[PDB]
Symmetry: C3
Subunit: 80 residues, 3 copies
């Protein structure tokens, strides 16, 4: 059963992660942002990272912290 998740206006999405609650996180590379879609939701949320330049990878730990590879700034950023 293939389903398309109701994200909005993605622009070359690259990294993705899924947490224990079924929320899906996407490094929306072409929009320099990380978006999150809760399970069952139709409205995605742009997370409050700042200063990203072509973010590639996203990861989420067991306590809900979100990590992104900010590729063109050669750094890894954590949002708590």
């Amino acid at each position: 059963n293939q389903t398309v998740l109701p994200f909005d206006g993605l622009n070359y999405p690259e990294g993705l992660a899924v947490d224990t609650q079924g929320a899906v996180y996407v490094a929306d590379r072409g929009n320099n942002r990380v978006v999150k879609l809760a399970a069952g939701s139709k409205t995605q949320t742009v997370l409050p990272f700042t200063g990203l330049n072509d973010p590639d990878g996203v990861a989420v730990d067991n306590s809900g912290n979100v990590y992104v590879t900010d590729t063109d700034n050669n750094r890894v950023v954590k949002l708590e």
Copy 2:
């Protein structure tokens, strides 16, 4: 600290990968527009029955075994 090459076949620019709770490894074989899976101990990958992928980049797997992929060039996230 022993390195092993896993017995995937015919990969073309493999990009994202994920590993589930049972040790199965999922790979976004971007250059072949497919997602392949090698169960722990298996010798032959399976090709997951996604449709219409184009330069898929990221893969993730949730606790219930659902597989999520960033279909980059189609600006969408697909769930199996």
Copy 3:
């Protein structure tokens, strides 16, 4: 709290994939340096994992047993450590 912090990795060069394990250690596919680097939570120490012969690795994953997996993209292969 939405506080943003830059993790104290050293010398990354176009980092791509990342993973976090159950202890909070962060693993990065440091693509431009053909290496995978690990930073334990709160540490000032990064560890270069003993993968060999990588070429532009892009993806990294870590399983519950601590085994580490990397897509060695330009070598068209997936390698496992442990």
